[PDB]
């Protein structure tokens, strides 16, 4: 076997900025059915009988899974099972959101409808989250080394050091005034262990709400990082190596993923 996990056509930067090749179905996880997180929406591939890796995603300065619907759908369409949670509360802090992400991942493994479980390879799991949720991503990554990848988006957290070996790609927003890049995203990046694969990208002319609507840069880098590590799909290395992107105002990496 070459790469059992590889999915979809050969990628072009262009295709990575709109919904991908797989058809997508959704399933609402009602708040009324689960314990350690609010509800959620699972986005998953139909029209295929391959299994995909799984992603749990936390919303940002709200409880609403709808705020990241575009990106749950987006990642799904490129070949993922994606559970976007609602949080228990509007005001849940990063560490509680880490708990909720944990619960959503267990939900995916143990509790999802048969339609979903069928598309899912529960051995290949990753996390993403906006803001507060992004801080959660770092915490949960620190606690579960078996996660494939973490993608914090304009992350916010009071703690600055996370001891994780999970590959991290952080998206900062240059004009973010709620989680300023130099007090949040960049410290997170710098404090990760030296041996962990990591990338920081900073969106020019974007604020904390940048992840809340369709966004080409967030799309390209999130899809590529997920593909690279969840799927071991090195065809995605090209979007994360020798990067040159006018959308970006900063780019930092230890370049372990270009090996």
Author numbering: 1 to 259
From the manuscript:
Enzymatic degradation of PET using suitable hydrolases, like the leaf branch compost cutinase (LCC) variant ICCG, offers potential for PET recycling under relatively mild reaction conditions. Computer-aided enzyme engineering performed by Tournier et al. introduced an Ile at LCC position F243 to enhance the enzyme’s catalytic activity by further expanding the substrate-binding site. Additionally, thermostability was increased to 94 °C by disulfide bond formation between D238C and S283C in combination with mutation Y127G. In this study, ICCG was utilized for the application of a crystal contact engineering strategy to increase crystallizability and test the rationality of the applied approach.
